[PDB]
Amino acid sequence: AKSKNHTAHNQTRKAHRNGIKKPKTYKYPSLKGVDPKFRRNHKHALHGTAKALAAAKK
Amino acid sequence: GKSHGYRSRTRYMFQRDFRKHGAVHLSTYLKVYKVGDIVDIKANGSIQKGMPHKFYQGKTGVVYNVTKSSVGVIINKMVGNRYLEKRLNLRVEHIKHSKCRQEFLERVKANAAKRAEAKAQGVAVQLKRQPAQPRESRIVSTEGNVPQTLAPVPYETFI
Amino acid sequence: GIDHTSKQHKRSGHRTAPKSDNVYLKLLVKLYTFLARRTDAPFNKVVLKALFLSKINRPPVSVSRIARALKQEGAANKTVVVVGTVTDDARIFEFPKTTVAALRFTAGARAKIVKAGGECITLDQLAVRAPKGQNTLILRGPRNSREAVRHFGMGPHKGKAPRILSTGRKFERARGRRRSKGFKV
Amino acid sequence: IHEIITVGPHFKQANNFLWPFKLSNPSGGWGVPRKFKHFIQGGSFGNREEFINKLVKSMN
Amino acid sequence: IQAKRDAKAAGSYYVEAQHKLVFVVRIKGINKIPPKPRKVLQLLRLTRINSGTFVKVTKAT
Amino acid sequence: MAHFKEYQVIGRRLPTESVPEPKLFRMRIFASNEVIAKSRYWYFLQKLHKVKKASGEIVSINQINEAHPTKVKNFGVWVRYDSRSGTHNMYKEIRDVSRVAAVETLYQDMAARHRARFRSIHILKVAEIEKTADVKRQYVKQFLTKDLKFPLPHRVQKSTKTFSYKRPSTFY
RNA sequence: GGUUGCGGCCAUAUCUACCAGAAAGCACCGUUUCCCGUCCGAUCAACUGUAGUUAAGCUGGUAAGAGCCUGACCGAGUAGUGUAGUGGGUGACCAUACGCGAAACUCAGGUGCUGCAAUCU
RNA sequence: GCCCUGAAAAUGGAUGGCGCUCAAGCGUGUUACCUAUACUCUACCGUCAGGGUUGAUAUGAUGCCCUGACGAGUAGGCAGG
RNA sequence: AAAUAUGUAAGAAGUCCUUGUUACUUAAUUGAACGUGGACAUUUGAAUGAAGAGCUUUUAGUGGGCCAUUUUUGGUAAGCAGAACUGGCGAUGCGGGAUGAACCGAACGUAGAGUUAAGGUGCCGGAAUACACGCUCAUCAGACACCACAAAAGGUGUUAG
RNA sequence: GGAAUACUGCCAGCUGGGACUGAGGACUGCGACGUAAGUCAAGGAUGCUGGCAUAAUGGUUAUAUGCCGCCCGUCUUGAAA
RNA sequence: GAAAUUGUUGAAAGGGAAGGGCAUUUGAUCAGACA
Ligand SMILES: [Mg+2]
Ligand SMILES: [Mg+2]
Ligand SMILES: [Mg+2]
Ligand SMILES: [Mg+2]
Ligand SMILES: [Mg+2]
Ligand SMILES: [Mg+2]
Ligand SMILES: [Mg+2]
Ligand SMILES: [Mg+2]
Ligand SMILES: [Mg+2]
Ligand SMILES: [Mg+2]
Ligand SMILES: [Mg+2]
Ligand SMILES: [Mg+2]
Ligand SMILES: [Mg+2]
Ligand SMILES: [Mg+2]
Ligand SMILES: [Mg+2]
Ligand SMILES: [Mg+2]
Ligand SMILES: [Mg+2]
Ligand SMILES: [Mg+2]
Ligand SMILES: [Mg+2]
Ligand SMILES: [Mg+2]
Ligand SMILES: [Mg+2]
Ligand SMILES: [Mg+2]
Ligand SMILES: [Mg+2]
Ligand SMILES: [Mg+2]
Ligand SMILES: [Mg+2]
Ligand SMILES: [Mg+2]
Ligand SMILES: [Mg+2]
Ligand SMILES: [Mg+2]
Ligand SMILES: [Mg+2]
Ligand SMILES: [Mg+2]
Ligand SMILES: [Mg+2]
Ligand SMILES: [Mg+2]
Ligand SMILES: [Mg+2]
Ligand SMILES: [Mg+2]
Ligand SMILES: [Mg+2]
Ligand SMILES: [Mg+2]
Ligand SMILES: [Mg+2]
Ligand SMILES: [Mg+2]
Ligand SMILES: [Mg+2]
Ligand SMILES: [Mg+2]
Ligand SMILES: [Mg+2]
Ligand SMILES: [Mg+2]
Ligand SMILES: [Mg+2]
Ligand SMILES: [Mg+2]
Ligand SMILES: [Mg+2]
Ligand SMILES: [Mg+2]
Ligand SMILES: [Mg+2]
Ligand SMILES: [Mg+2]
Ligand SMILES: [Mg+2]
Ligand SMILES: [Mg+2]
Ligand SMILES: [Mg+2]
Ligand SMILES: [Mg+2]
Ligand SMILES: [Mg+2]
Ligand SMILES: [Mg+2]
Ligand SMILES: [Mg+2]
Ligand SMILES: [Mg+2]
Ligand SMILES: [Mg+2]
Ligand SMILES: [Mg+2]
Ligand SMILES: [Mg+2]
Ligand SMILES: [Mg+2]
C-alpha cells in the first residue's frame, strides 16, 4: 500500500488565503534577552529621572 | 536515511572566499554596534563560536542587545502564513553595519537642506523621488554623421 | 467574469440593531438613530452603537470607577454616561455629587449616588438634556476582566489558566508544569 | 480629458477618478486569427502603439 | 509637424519624445493566469476582459 | 507575414556623456506595418552590433516608395534561409513591378518550395538587374524573348448559378 | 621626501634576476660578570654602544619577466535564462516574439595607497 | 521540398462521416463570414454596500425611498422559509 | 559566474539642537540607555492599487489525491515510480478539440439586442465550392496542437537551390 | 516644374436603410432654440389609425418536427460503465 | 376505499427500447380581460 510521500502543492495557495501577515511593529519593543547588567542599572536610572520629573512638579 | 544537521547543506556557503582565508582583519573588531543599528548577517566559517544558522545568511536585522563580544540581532522569520520574531545572538564577526539605509539617511540630510535652501529662498521645491521618466524630443545631426547602412549576412562556417 | 479581489457579498460584521428584544431598548435605539442621523454630533453615533452591544461587550461600570473619572483634570462637573448597568462599590468612602446616565442602576449604585446628592438619569433624559451630549463623559467597563478571557490563547509558555474543573494539586500541576516532572510548559 | 492626455501634475487623481472603462469586443473583429501572440507576430497582445486607437474605437 | 520638417530641412532627424501616456486593454479572460501577472493585472484595475484604463508611463510602470 | 512596405529605419546607441553623437545605422526593412519594421531593425542590429533596443534609440523610420512602379523589372534576390537540418544561402530572381511586390512573392516561394516560414528567412539583398543576359534564371529569361506572345488554352468561365443550361466551352 | 615605533586596507604589497642607496635610523656586529635559556650565548637572556660593516637585512630602480590589480561596443548582445504561441520537427531538438544577460578570449594601462608619533642632509 | 521505397496481424471500418486531385491536399499570404453560460447596452430577481426619511391629520420603522457593485460550487458552515 | 527567485530600507515611531537620571561604563559627567526643553508639516519625502484596516472567540469538513507546461530523480521503457514552482481537474457546467475528468476558449441569477473567443465556413452543418503565389499524382496519396506514432537508409519522380 | 491620386488619420460635417428596447409616473435638474411670448429631441414613448372583442391572443396538454439529453444512489484520483 | 397492478370503453403514437430539454405546427381543453 504505498502512497504519496510529500508535496508542497497548494500550500502557498493557503498561506495567501488569509495572509502572510506583515510582521507587526511596536514602538517600545521589549527588553527581553537584553543584558541584565544593563537592565539592572537602567531600572535605577529611570527611577531616578522619574523621581526628578516628579520633583519638577512641586 | 536523511540528514538535516545544524550546518547541513552549507558547503560553499560558509566557505571562505578565494585567497581570503586566514585571520579576520582587525577592523572587523574595531567597528562599534549600538542598539537599533541595522546589520547584515553573513557567517564567517573560520569563526565557529557564535555563528548564525544557515537560514539567517544574507539576512538583515536590527541590533536589540549589546554584550561583551556579541550583538543580539532580531530577525523576522516567517513560518506558515506569518512572521515570528527571532532574537539571534551573533558574534561581531558574522555582522556588518548595513548600507541598506544610508541612501535614505543621506537623502534626508540632503532633503532638509534644499528645503531650507528653498524656504529661505522663495519656496518652490519638489523633493520626492520620481522614477525614470521617458526622454524628451531631441534632434540628431548629420554633420560628421551619415547613417551607414547594414544588411544581414550570409551563412558561413570557419572550422 | 471578474478576477475578484475580495469576498463577494460580505456582511459588514457589525450589529445594526440590538440582538435583544426589549421594546424599551428598541425605543432608546429609536431615539438615538434619529439623533445620530440629524445632529452630526459624534457622541450620538457612539451611543447608538453601544446600545447594540451584547452583554459581554457591556461590562458594568462601578460607582467607584465613576468617582475616579470625575477626579480627572477638569471633569468633576461633567455628566458621566454609561451604556450598561452601573453597580455599587462598598470600597469608596467618599462619593461625589454628579449626574450619571445609564441603562440600569443597581439598587445600591443608585442609592450611593443619590445619598451623595447626585442624580440617576435614563439615556433618554440624557438626550433631552444634552442632544449633542454636551458636557458628557462616556465610561466603559473592563471588557477583559471576564473569566472567560482567562482561557483564551491557551498553549505552551503562554501562562494562561487551563480549562479545568476541580483544581488543587493532583490537577494538572505535574509533568509539563515543573522542571522535575519531564519539562515545564 | 485634458489632465489625462497631457498627463498633468494631477494625473494620479484624475485617472483614478475614472472607473476602468468597460468596452465591448472589437466590432469588426481582431484582424488576427489568433489573439494570444504579440502584435508583431501577427497576434493581438503587446504594445501596438498608435494602432491601439483603431482597435479601442471598434470596441468602444 | 514643423519640427520634423525643419529638421529634414537642416539635414537632421527629429526624434519625438517617447510617449508619456499609454492605454491598456485586458485581452485575456479570467482564468489560468499565473500569480505575478495576475497581481499586476489587478493593480492596474484590469480584472475583467476588455475593460481598460490609462497608464502614465515611467520605468516603474 | 503580410502585404509589405519597405522602410528605411535608423537607430543609434543612446548617447553617453563621453560619447555624445553615436554612429547612426540604416536598414531597409520589408515589413507590413512599421511596428514590425522597428522590431526587425533591432533584431538584425543586435546580430551585428553591441546594442539592444534598451540601450539604443530609433532615430527615424520612413517608407521608401518604389521609384518606377509601373516599370517591369527583373529582380535578382539574395536570401539566407533556414531549413530543418541546417541553414543556407540562396539566390533567386523575381520579375515584377515593385520591390515590395517582389518581396511579397519571395516569401510565398520560400514557403511553397522550401517550407520556409517568415521567421526563418533573411533578405540579404534585393536589387534590380540592369542588362538582360545578366539575368541568370531560366524561368525568367523565358520572359524576355523578343516579340513574345502566348495563348491561354482551356478557358474557365466562372459560373454564377448552380445550374447551367448550356454545357461549357473552354475556347479562348 | 628618507627612516623608525605602532598601524589600516591586505600582492598595484607577492615571485624571479640584476643594479643603486647620501644623511640619519634600522640593521648586521662586540661581550658573558649579572637575571635568563640552550646538546650549542645560533635562537632566547643579559652587558657595551665601546671594537667593526653596508656584505646582507631594509628601501628603491631595471625586466617585449611570472603573478596580481584596473579598463574596453575585444569577444558577445555570444552562451545561458524569465515570459508567449493550436510555432517548425517522427523525434532529438530548433527557430521566432517581449525582456535580462555571462565566462573564457583578445588588446590597453598599472605594479602598494595611506594614519599617528619621533627623527634626519 | 512534396511524392514514392523502406512499411508485417488477427470480426468489417474509419482525415468524425461522405467524398475531394489547377482540392474539399501540403506551405504561405489577404479579405469576408458563422457562433459561448464570455464582452457591451437594457429589463427583472436575489445578495452585499452606501445615502435619505418618525412629521402628523391612515394602512407594514424588522418599514418606505435613492443609488452602486456582485451572482460557479462537492465536503462543509450559516441563514430565511 | 548569470537569468528567475530572495533579506532590508524608502521618515512624525522622522532628522537635528539644548543638557537631566544611574548602582552600569569611562582616566575622566567619559559613555551607554531613558528622559526634560527647543527648531522644521504634508512634494512629510518613489510607483500602482486599496468595496477599508486591525483584532478576538469558537467550530465543520479534510488529513487516499490526480493532471498539464517548465525544472527534475530512478527505470530500456510505460497511460510506470518519485520531487520543484505555478496553473488546473477533483468540487464545474458553457463554446471548441467528432468522441474524452485535466488541452484550447471562457468560469454560470432570469432574459432581449449586439460583438466576439478558441475553432470553423463543399455536403452532413450555422458560415466564401472566396481571393492569391507555389508545391504534390501515391496499383496502400494526404488532410491541423495535446492526439491517438513510425526510423536508418534509398529514388535518373518532380520542384527549387 | 505643377497638379492629381493612393494610403493613414481627423471633423463637437451632412445623410439613408434595418433591428431590439420604451424601465420611470405631478412638479423639482443640467441644458438647448428664441429679440421676445414661447418652444424643445434637455433627469426613460408618445401620437394617429385599424382589426378582434373572442379561443382571436394566451395557458395547459397530447402529438409531430429541428437541434440537444447515457442510470440514479455510492465509494472513488477517476462510473453511463 | 390511495398506490403498484388489471378488464372494458374513448383518444393518440409507434421502421432495433421508452422517457427528458428549448422551441413551434396541429388537435383537444381552459382562465382572464373586455363593455
Ligand atoms: Mg499501507
Ligand atoms: Mg500509486
Ligand atoms: Mg498521505
Ligand atoms: Mg542525504
Ligand atoms: Mg522525521
Ligand atoms: Mg595564510
Ligand atoms: Mg566549543
Ligand atoms: Mg478575578
Ligand atoms: Mg465598424
Ligand atoms: Mg464593415
Ligand atoms: Mg459583422
Ligand atoms: Mg484558426
Ligand atoms: Mg460599438
Ligand atoms: Mg492606472
Ligand atoms: Mg526605390
Ligand atoms: Mg650610515
Ligand atoms: Mg653561564
Ligand atoms: Mg652573539
Ligand atoms: Mg637578546
Ligand atoms: Mg649593496
Ligand atoms: Mg627591518
Ligand atoms: Mg608582467
Ligand atoms: Mg529561455
Ligand atoms: Mg511548444
Ligand atoms: Mg542555439
Ligand atoms: Mg492516416
Ligand atoms: Mg471535413
Ligand atoms: Mg491553404
Ligand atoms: Mg466574400
Ligand atoms: Mg445570459
Ligand atoms: Mg451560489
Ligand atoms: Mg463563490
Ligand atoms: Mg522582491
Ligand atoms: Mg487609490
Ligand atoms: Mg473604501
Ligand atoms: Mg478549524
Ligand atoms: Mg483533524
Ligand atoms: Mg481517509
Ligand atoms: Mg494547465
Ligand atoms: Mg473525492
Ligand atoms: Mg471548468
Ligand atoms: Mg481528435
Ligand atoms: Mg495558454
Ligand atoms: Mg453525415
Ligand atoms: Mg451552410
Ligand atoms: Mg507540432
Ligand atoms: Mg529521407
Ligand atoms: Mg528529391
Ligand atoms: Mg412607460
Ligand atoms: Mg413606464
Ligand atoms: Mg374566454
Ligand atoms: Mg375570432
Ligand atoms: Mg411529451
Ligand atoms: Mg445525441
Ligand atoms: Mg459504493
Ligand atoms: Mg479504484
Ligand atoms: Mg454514477
Ligand atoms: Mg368497502
Ligand atoms: Mg390522447
Ligand atoms: Mg411544449
Side-chain angles (χ1 to χ4, degrees):
Chain A
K2 316 226 264 164
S3 76
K4 180 115 207 166
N5 286 292
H6 154 79
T7 181
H9 198 56
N10 181 257
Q11 300 302 293
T12 21
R13 226 278 314 189
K14 310 200 312 192
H16 281 85
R17 299 254 55 189
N18 277 311
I20 307 298
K21 322 187 147 285
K22 218 44 211 132
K24 197 84 9 54
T25 169
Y26 291 100
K27 168 54 102 96
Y28 302 87
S30 69
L31 297 197
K32 189 259 273 269
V34 143
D35 160 78
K37 208 225 227 166
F38 181 94
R39 206 167 153 190
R40 221 166 310 100
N41 176 83
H42 169 74
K43 153 194 284 145
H44 299 324
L46 304 202
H47 195 279
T49 126
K51 180 193 309 320
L53 263 177
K57 210 31 186 173
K58 88 289 157 36
Chain B
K2 313 286 236 195
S3 177
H4 299 292
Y6 202 90
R7 274 182 48 150
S8 90
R9 306 193 178 144
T10 69
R11 206 211 248 238
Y12 303 112
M13 173 155 144
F14 284 177
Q15 250 189 348
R16 199 64 184 97
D17 276 32
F18 193 37
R19 293 215 293 269
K20 308 226 175 297
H21 286 254
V24 355
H25 58 25
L26 243 278
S27 78
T28 291
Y29 297 100
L30 289 178
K31 262 134 63 51
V32 174
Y33 299 81
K34 296 201 292 159
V35 199
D37 288 18
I38 300 173
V39 308
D40 303 321
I41 293 178
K42 161 162 88 78
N44 174 358
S46 59
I47 296 318
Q48 277 91 65
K49 240 152 170 85
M51 257 174 27
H53 178 273
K54 75 225 233 209
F55 174 77
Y56 302 87
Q57 175 92 342
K59 247 84 162 185
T60 308
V62 187
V63 175
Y64 81 95
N65 188 40
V66 165
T67 147
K68 180 183 64 68
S69 73
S70 305
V71 309
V73 183
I74 136 270
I75 283 289
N76 288 323
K77 172 166 181 177
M78 89 93 173
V79 348
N81 54 344
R82 104 216 111 133
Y83 288 71
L84 318 175
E85 207 190 54
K86 313 249 82 193
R87 347 281 231 182
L88 275 49
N89 286 326
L90 301 183
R91 260 216 161 75
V92 284
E93 290 116 299
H94 313 284
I95 283 323
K96 58 189 319 167
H97 278 127
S98 172
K99 286 257 270 203
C100 77
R101 195 150 192 270
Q102 65 142 16
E103 103 90 343
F104 168 70
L105 243 31
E106 278 162 3
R107 183 155 51 96
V108 189
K109 276 220 134 41
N111 273 354
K114 26 173 177 176
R115 174 205 293 262
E117 225 270 340
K119 155 137 285 160
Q121 215 332 287
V123 248
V125 237
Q126 194 272 133
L127 41 13
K128 285 162 146 256
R129 306 177 296 169
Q130 231 70 22
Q133 306 289 346
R135 50 200 130 70
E136 304 284 282
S137 78
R138 63 251 223 133
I139 304 205
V140 341
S141 186
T142 253
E143 259 235 1
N145 193 7
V146 177
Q148 222 245 253
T149 292
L150 322 178
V153 205
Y155 179 57
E156 239 179 333
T157 14
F158 19 99
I159 267 309
Chain C
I2 356 260
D3 203 332
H4 282 307
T5 62
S6 34
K7 277 183 194 165
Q8 292 307 269
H9 312 124
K10 142 173 67 83
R11 282 157 291 173
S12 65
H14 314 99
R15 293 193 150 173
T16 291
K19 209 207 186 323
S20 131
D21 240 314
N22 169 6
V23 257
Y24 304 93
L25 216 208
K26 301 221 247 63
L27 296 194
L28 272 163
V29 182
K30 194 207 141 160
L31 204 215
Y32 261 91
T33 89
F34 177 80
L35 287 157
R37 199 176 74 251
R38 305 236 260 144
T39 60
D40 86 26
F43 168 96
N44 289 331
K45 4 201 177 304
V46 165
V47 185
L48 204 243
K49 296 269 198 36
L51 295 167
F52 315 151
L53 284 177
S54 124
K55 176 173 159 182
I56 256 186
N57 315 109
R58 269 198 278 115
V61 170
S62 101
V63 86
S64 83
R65 154 183 270 93
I66 298 195
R68 213 195 274 297
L70 304 167
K71 278 168 86 294
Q72 242 149 291
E73 243 266 37
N77 283 318
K78 275 196 193 149
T79 99
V80 321
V81 167
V82 162
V83 187
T85 71
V86 168
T87 61
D88 180 21
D89 189 344
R91 299 178 297 205
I92 13 161
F93 282 56
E94 233 76 269
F95 186 91
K97 221 203 182 93
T98 29
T99 342
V100 176
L103 282 156
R104 282 155 249 250
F105 292 91
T106 54
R110 138 176 289 122
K112 163 157 287 174
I113 273 177
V114 176
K115 165 154 167 165
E119 188 179 33
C120 302
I121 291 325
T122 60
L123 283 189
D124 67 305
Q125 305 180 311
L126 188 268
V128 220
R129 275 198 210 178
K132 313 236 182 54
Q134 15 275 113
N135 208 23
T136 54
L137 210 211
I138 305 203
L139 300 171
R140 304 214 217 60
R143 293 207 171 160
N144 260 30
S145 294
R146 195 160 108 268
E147 201 276 348
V149 336
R150 281 216 305 154
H151 305 318
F152 297 165
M154 181 62 166
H157 301 298
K158 323 193 56 195
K160 270 208 112 30
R163 267 153 185 175
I164 184 164
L165 293 207
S166 286
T167 93
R169 79 145 183 116
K170 266 150 62 77
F171 302 93
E172 329 203 343
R173 225 174 297 256
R175 189 199 93 107
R177 260 333 179 113
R178 24 183 74 232
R179 231 56 154 186
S180 43
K181 284 273 153 28
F183 66 92
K184 202 249 172 162
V185 193
Chain D
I1 282 165
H2 176 262
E3 191 73 359
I4 297 287
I5 175 154
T6 73
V7 176
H10 282 291
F11 176 88
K12 207 201 200 268
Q13 286 84 16
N15 172 65
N16 184 273
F17 174 70
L18 303 100
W19 204 268
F21 292 87
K22 298 171 25 105
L23 27 129
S24 171
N25 275 307
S27 204
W30 300 82
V32 306
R34 313 221 332 129
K35 258 169 63 171
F36 299 110
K37 282 173 188 155
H38 211 280
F39 187 70
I40 317 201
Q41 281 204 164
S44 270
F45 72 70
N47 182 358
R48 64 171 72 184
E49 308 194 23
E50 264 269 73
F51 288 117
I52 200 60
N53 293 291
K54 204 265 191 119
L55 214 212
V56 171
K57 284 178 158 196
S58 46
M59 318 175 62
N60 182 192
Chain E
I1 287 124
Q2 188 70 358
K4 283 196 223 164
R5 294 166 178 180
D6 277 330
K8 296 216 284 283
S12 271
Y13 281 109
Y14 176 80
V15 309
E16 292 179 314
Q18 351 179 244
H19 298 66
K20 306 222 302 287
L21 184 268
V22 301
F23 180 73
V24 179
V25 198
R26 138 117 67 162
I27 272 328
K28 174 73 170 176
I30 215 29
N31 3 49
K32 283 157 168 198
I33 313 279
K36 174 115 74 164
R38 181 219 222 237
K39 172 48 142 182
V40 171
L41 275 181
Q42 285 153 2
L43 283 186
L44 300 179
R45 320 183 294 160
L46 301 142
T47 59
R48 118 224 264 129
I49 175 156
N50 286 344
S51 75
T53 86
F54 291 97
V55 171
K56 167 195 203 285
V57 185
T58 59
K59 174 62 150 176
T61 59
Chain F
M1 161 248 43
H3 174 42
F4 295 90
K5 292 190 212 137
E6 199 195 342
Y7 305 84
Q8 115 157 328
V9 193
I10 297 195
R12 53 167 196 176
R13 338 194 40 209
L14 287 183
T16 83
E17 156 213 329
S18 59
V19 200
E21 288 125 322
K23 230 211 286 208
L24 278 192
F25 305 87
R26 183 176 161 272
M27 291 195 66
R28 295 177 70 129
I29 293 290
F30 294 85
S32 50
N33 62 57
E34 40 156 303
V35 142
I36 303 172
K38 299 183 296 182
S39 183
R40 293 314 281 153
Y41 173 89
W42 282 121
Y43 163 88
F44 291 110
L45 243 280
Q46 309 179 23
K47 259 214 283 307
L48 300 176
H49 291 1
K50 264 286 188 48
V51 275
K52 50 176 199 177
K53 165 191 159 117
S55 52
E57 156 177 79
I58 301 299
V59 187
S60 197
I61 167 66
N62 302 86
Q63 187 179 323
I64 303 153
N65 304 336
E66 175 82 43
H68 292 336
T70 59
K71 206 263 227 75
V72 163
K73 273 170 276 212
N74 288 357
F75 298 92
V77 187
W78 290 255
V79 129
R80 170 200 223 192
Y81 109 89
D82 247 337
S83 81
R84 319 209 168 111
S85 1
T87 156
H88 319 279
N89 307 296
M90 202 173 263
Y91 168 76
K92 228 131 191 319
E93 303 192 342
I94 322 193
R95 182 167 159 101
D96 208 324
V97 197
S98 72
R99 305 155 51 99
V100 136
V103 143
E104 169 85 73
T105 100
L106 184 180
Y107 272 117
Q108 303 297 128
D109 204 59
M110 297 295 306
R113 313 197 119 111
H114 304 277
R115 266 57 221 217
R117 335 293 156 151
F118 187 90
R119 44 175 180 258
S120 277
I121 291 165
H122 280 12
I123 322 302
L124 299 180
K125 166 121 112 100
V126 164
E128 170 175 315
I129 308 165
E130 237 66 36
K131 35 183 146 94
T132 102
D134 291 70
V135 176
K136 291 207 151 47
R137 230 113 249 187
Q138 134 98 107
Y139 52 68
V140 171
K141 268 183 139 198
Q142 232 198 198
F143 284 113
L144 317 157
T145 103
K146 183 96 167 310
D147 301 328
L148 169 54
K149 311 185 172 156
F150 56 87
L152 285 180
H154 196 69
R155 188 95 143 296
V156 263
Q157 352 236 23
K158 190 195 48 65
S159 175
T160 10
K161 326 177 44 181
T162 94
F163 302 132
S164 181
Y165 290 94
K166 223 165 231 115
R167 209 107 213 172
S169 166
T170 61
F171 95 95
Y172 199 16

